[PDB]
Design a protein around this nucleic acid. Structure first.
Lengths: 213, 212
DNA sequence: GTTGGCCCGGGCCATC
DNA sequence: GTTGGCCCGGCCATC
């Protein structure tokens, strides 16, 4: 496995915490080519690359959001149904894959605390559709682990890292797209160091076990 | 047809003006359920909380004209540096699957769409042999719409935006920036726009391709 | 850097 | 509203 050709920054919102077997309510993928981070007065926050692919979607979960999640995310099952949202079905999996197929391979998903939430949860959704092997060619990285390594070479939530790095809070927190753009900014802090950490720790996604599947 | 259930605001960037047989370099679709326009929430309007957004860069067959690169900040060598792929079958299936997530009838909204975004998109699909893919959708030129809304009450995207809101829109001359600025404008009188679009939603299949 | 509809033959303008 | 893991018995971190 060589250098990752595309970094796909990734975040989801869901009906609750892992023990509740949550269902996806919102997702965002932002695919960035390696050269945007290998060869990017100066601003405090790095400007996102001009050439990006972005996909943001709301998802009808099969059940009610927990009250705490509705409060944090601004999404509820009833409102999603009012906007006619469809559930996490086969067409959505085909959509995700068609988006990824626009990106040079190898792919590396990047998600904040991904190993405990975003990655198992996506794998659960795909597993329930029998598409457990649809992302087997992909790689993934947890940006909390990466940022710990980069910083040491204290809270590590997305908000705390952003503010510690950039001295201000990111806009539109606790949305899938807002948290993805914030994550992009954090990873653009020392982009070279991050690319070398990703290349050395890119984990096959097929080894991510479903959260509840 | 009845009430359009989904307005998909739409902009593309490309290599040049219509005379040069331009090729798409960037596109953005932003689908908004009509209920986000009929009963909005409680000075630019905030976008709806619930939206679907697709934004992509495309490798064109040819070079970008010098002015188009200046305006858009895209060039054909740079798109190749980012390993962008051409307008192909997969991309056509991408757009169709994204539209499948939206309730029908669909209506595309595009600024000066009757003369650029719509025929350019139709031409790309026609070179792929896919000239009937998006024909179940409707389309509406927001210049025609906004002219009538101010009539009963320059028409470039920037001039409209500054007239209603007073400041310049951010990220102008990108596909997403243009779409987001278009959304904000269409949220000025969302009630009257919905009635307008419903009264003048035109089948996408009545649009002839820009070339080929 | 254009030119095909829109305003009101022809000049203006809007997409990139 | 917190489980399950980590930074080095406490206390986060994704919703």
């Amino acid at each position: 496995p060589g250098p990752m050709q595309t970094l796909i920054f990734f975040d989801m919102e869901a009906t609750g915490l892992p023990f509740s077997q949550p269902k996806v309510t919102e997702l965002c993928l932002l695919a960035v080519h390696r050269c945007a981070l290998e060869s990017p007065p100066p601003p405090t926050v790095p400007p996102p690359p001009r050439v990006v692919d972005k996909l943001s979607l709301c998802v009808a979960p099969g059940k009610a959001c927990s009250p705490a999640a509705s409060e944090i995310t601004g999404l509820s099952t009833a409102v999603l149904a009012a906007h006619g949202r469809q559930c996490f079905d086969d067409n959505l999996a085909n959509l995700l894959l068609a988006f990824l197929r626009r990106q040079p391979q190898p792919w590396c998903l990047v998600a904040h605390n991904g190993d405990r939430y975003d990655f198992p949860l996506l794998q659960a959704e795909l597993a329930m559709l029998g598409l457990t092997s649809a992302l087997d060619g992909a790689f993934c990285v947890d940006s909390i682990t990466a940022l710990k390594a980069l910083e040491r070479a204290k809270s590590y939530s997305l908000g705390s890292i952003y503010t510690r790095l950039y001295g201000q809070s990111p806009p539109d927190s606790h949305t899938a797209e807002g948290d993805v753009l914030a994550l992009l900014s954090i990873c653009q802090w020392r982009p070279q160091a991050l690319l070398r950490w990703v290349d050395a720790h890119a984990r096959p996604f097929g080894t991510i076990r479903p959260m509840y599947g």
